[PDB]
C-alpha cells in the first residue's frame, strides 16, 4: 500500500499529515525573563504531535514498533529543528519557536552555549530562504529525516531487520522520485533537478550536525525522550 | 570549466596514499596512541589532497581552514569505511592495523563508534560503491560540511559560498554522469544520487560522535587546532 503511491499522492499524504504549529505556554500579561523551561515545554508538547505525524508518513507504520521507536529516537531533534527552520524562513535574523516566541540571537545569549546553536539554525533558515524552499519539498525532506537518520544504526542482521531496512530504502526512493517530480513540475531542467536534489539533501547533513550539537547542549545541563516513553506513546 | 570525466580524473589523481600504523610488528600487541598517530600523519596528506580538489584553492585561506576544520574527521572516516569495504566485520585503519569490534572494546566508548563505521562499510558494500563515486563523495564532504557555518555575510563571503555551491553542483553533475555511463536509468540515477548523499548525513553523525569521544577521553589535544591547520595550509611557493 505504501509503495503504491504516485508522486502527487505521496505529496498529498505528506501535506495532510503536517502537525500543527504549537504556542509557547507563558502568561503574556506577565513580564518576560524560564528560557530553557519555555523551549523544553514546547518540545515536550510537539513530540506527541510528531508521533501522530510519523504514523501518517507512508510506509512508517508498516515497520515493527521497535524500529519505529528507533527511527524516532534517532531523528526527533532533527525533526523539531527542520520544522523550526522552516517556520523561521520568512523571519530573517529570528527563530520562530512558536508564533508567540520569536527570538533573535541575542535572546539565545541568556543560556550558556545556546547562541552557537541559534547561529547555526539561523544560517540554515537563510539557506532555505536563499534556495526558495517550497512547502512540498519541505515535507519530503522532513519525512526523509524520519526514515534515514536511524536506518544505519539498527545494528541488527535478523531476516526481519533486512526486510525492514529494504522497506525503508524503498520508501526513501519513492520520496526521491517525488522531489524530482516536484522540480519537474516547477519547470527545472534535468540538470537543475539533480543539482537541487543534491543541494536539499546536503542540507540534511547540517541538520544532523545541529541535532548532535543540540543534544550535547542539552546533555551539558530527563529532557531527552527515553526509549520507553517513545515506545509507550507509539504503543 | 572542467568536464565530468576531467573532474573524475582530477579527483582520482589527487587521492592521498594509504598510510601504515607505526608499531614494531615483532613486539607484542597503545590503541589510542596507534589511532592518534595514524590520523596525525594522515592530516598532512589530507591537506595535500584538499589543495588538489578543483576549486578548493580558489577560496581564501581562512575559508580553506574553516572547511578542513569542519570536515577533517568525516574525511578520515569515509576513507576508513572505503578501505574497509572488502573486509566484512573489520576496520582497516591501516593495512597492518585491521581491527574487529572486539578490539574496539579496549577503549571505553569506542566500540559504539566502531559499530557505526562497520555498518557504514556494510552499507557501501550493499550499494557496490565505486571508486569514482567515493572520491566524489569525499570531495563533497570537504566542500559541504563547513559551508553553512562561516557566520559571515561580507561580500567576499557571499562570493565564497556561491563558488563552493558551484563546485558542489559540478560534482553532482559528475556523479550523475558516472551512473549514466554505468547504464543506470534516470530514475535509478536520482535514486542512487540520493542514497549516496544521505549516507553523508550518517558520516556527519559519526564524526560528531567521534569528536565527542575524543573529548571525553580527554584526548582533546588530538584535535587539529585552527592555528595548526592554518600553518600547514598557508604554504609558501618556495619549493
Ligand atoms: C519529569 C517530568 C518532566 N518531564 C518528563 C519532561 O519535561 C519531559 C522531557 C522529555 C521530552 C523532550 C524535552 C527536551 C526538548 C527541548 S529542545 C528545545 C525546544 C525546541 C523546539 C522546537 O520546535 C525546535 C527546536 C528546539 C530546540 C533547538 C536546540 C535547543 C535550542 C538546545 O540548544 C537547547 C533547547 C533546544 C530547543
Ligand atoms: C595544538 C597546537 C597544534 N598542534 C600540535 C595540533 O593541533 C596537533 C593535532 C594533530 C592531529 C592528530 C589527530 C588525532 C585524531 C585521532 S582519530 C582516530 C584515528 C582514525 C584514522 C582514520 O584513517 C579514520 C578514523 C580514525 C578515527 C575514527 C574515530 C575514532 C575511532 C574515535 O572513536 C577515537 C579515535 C578515532 C580514530
UniProtKB/Swiss-Prot annotation, chain B:
Q: Where in the cell is it found?
A: Nucleus; Golgi apparatus; Cell membrane
Q: How is it modified after translation?
A: Phosphorylated by cyclin A/CDK2 and CK1. Phosphorylation probably enhances transcriptional activity. Self-association induces phosphorylation. Phosphorylated by LMTK3 in vitro.
**Superkingdom of the source?**
Eukaryota
Q: Where is this region: Self-association?
A: 1-239
Q: Which region ranges are annotated with the description Interaction with AKAP13? A: 1-239
Annotated region (Transactivation AF-2) at 3-239
Q: Where is the lipid attached (S-palmitoyl cysteine)?
A: 136
Positions where Phosphotyrosine occurs in the chain: 226
Report where it is expressed, by tissue: Widely expressed. Not expressed in the pituitary gland.
Please report the stretch or stretches of sequence annotated as the NR LBD domain: 3-236
Q: From which residue to which does any coiled coil extend?
A: none
Look up what happens after changing residue 64 to H. Answer: In ESTRR; results in highly reduced activity
Task: Detail which positions bind 17beta-estradiol.
Answer: 42, 83, 213
Q: What outcome follows a substitution of residue 228 to A?
A: Abolishes interaction with NCOA1, NCOA2 and NCOA3
Q: Which family does it belong to?
A: Belongs to the nuclear hormone receptor family. NR3 subfamily.
Give the protein's biological function: Nuclear hormone receptor. The steroid hormones and their receptors are involved in the regulation of eukaryotic gene expression and affect cellular proliferation and differentiation in target tissues. Ligand-dependent nuclear transactivation involves either direct homodimer binding to a palindromic estrogen response element (ERE) sequence or association with other DNA-binding transcription factors, such as AP-1/c-Jun, c-Fos, ATF-2, Sp1 and Sp3, to mediate ERE-independent signaling.
Comment, domains: Composed of three domains: a modulating N-terminal domain, a DNA-binding domain and a C-terminal ligand-binding domain. The modulating domain, also known as A/B or AF-1 domain has a ligand-independent transactivation function. The C-terminus contains a ligand-dependent transactivation domain, also known as E/F or AF-2 domain which overlaps with the ligand binding domain. AF-1 and AF-2 activate transcription independently and synergistically and act in a promoter- and cell-specific manner. AF-1 seems to provide the major transactivation function in differentiated cells.
Note in the entry: Selective estrogen receptor modulators (SERMs), such as tamoxifen, raloxifene, toremifene, lasofoxifene, clomifene, femarelle and ormeloxifene, have tissue selective agonistic and antagonistic effects on the estrogen receptor (ER). They interfere with the ER association with coactivators or corepressors, mainly involving the AF-2 domain.
Its subunit composition reads: Binds DNA as a homodimer. Can form a heterodimer with ESR2. Interacts with FOXC2, MAP1S, SLC30A9, UBE1C and NCOA3 coactivator. Interacts with PELP1, the interaction is enhanced by 17-beta-estradiol, the interaction increases ESR1 transcriptional activity. Interacts with EP300; the interaction is estrogen-dependent and enhanced by CITED1. Interacts with CITED1; the interaction is estrogen-dependent. Interacts with NCOA5 and NCOA6 coactivators. Interacts with NCOA7; the interaction is a ligand-inducible. Interacts with PHB2, and UBE1C. Interacts with AKAP13. Interacts with CUEDC2.
Question: Which illness does the annotation name?
Answer: Estrogen resistance: A disorder characterized by partial or complete resistance to estrogens, in the presence of elevated estrogen serum levels. Clinical features include absence of the pubertal growth spurt, delayed bone maturation, unfused epiphyses, reduced bone mineral density, osteoporosis, continued growth into adulthood and very tall adult stature. Glucose intolerance, hyperinsulinemia and lipid abnormalities may also be present.
The protein's name: Estrogen receptor
Which portion of the complete protein is shown here?
309 to 550 of 595
Amino acid at each position: 500500500l505504501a509503495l503504491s503511491l504516485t508522486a502527487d499522492q505521496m505529496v498529498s499524504a505528506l501535506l495532510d499529515a503536517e502537525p500543527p504549529i504549537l504556542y509557547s505556554e507563558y502568561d503574556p500579561t506577565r513580564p518576560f525573563s524560564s528560557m530553557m523551561g519555555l523551549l523544553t515545554n514546547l518540545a515536550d508538547r510537539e513530540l506527541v504531535h510528531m508521533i501522530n505525524w510519523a504514523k501518517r508518513v507512508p510506509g512508517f507504520v508498516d515497520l515493527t514498533l521497535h524500529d519505529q521507536v528507533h527511527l524516532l529516537e534517532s531523528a526527533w531533534l532533527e525533526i523539531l529543528m527542520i520544522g523550526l527552520v522552516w517556520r523561521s524562513m520568512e523571519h530573517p535574523g529570528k527563530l520562530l519557536f512558536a508564533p508567540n516566541l520569536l527570538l533573535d540571537r541575542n535572546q539565545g545569549k541568556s543560556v550558556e552555549g545556546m547562541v552557537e546553536i541559534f547561529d547555526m539554525l539561523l544560517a540554515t533558515s537563510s539557506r532555505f530562504r536563499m534556495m526558495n524552499l517550497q512547502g512540498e519539498e519541505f515535507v519530503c525532506l522532513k519525512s526523509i529525516i524520519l526514515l534515514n537518520s536511524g536506518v544505519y544504526t539498527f545494528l541488527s542482521s535478523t531476516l526481519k531487520s533486512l526486510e525492514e531496512k529494504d522497506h525503508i530504502h524503498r520508501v526513501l526512493d519513492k520520496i526521491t522520485d517525488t522531489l524530482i517530480h516536484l522540480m519537474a513540475k516547477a519547470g527545472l531542467t534535468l540538470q537543475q533537478q539533480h543539482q537541487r536534489l543534491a543541494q536539499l539533501l546536503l542540507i540534511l547533513s547540517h541538520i544532523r550536525h545541529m541535532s548532535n550539537k543540540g543534544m550535547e547542549h542539552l546533555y551539558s545541563m530527563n529532557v531527552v525522550p527515553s526509549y520507553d516513553l517513545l515506545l509507550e506513546m507509539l504503543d
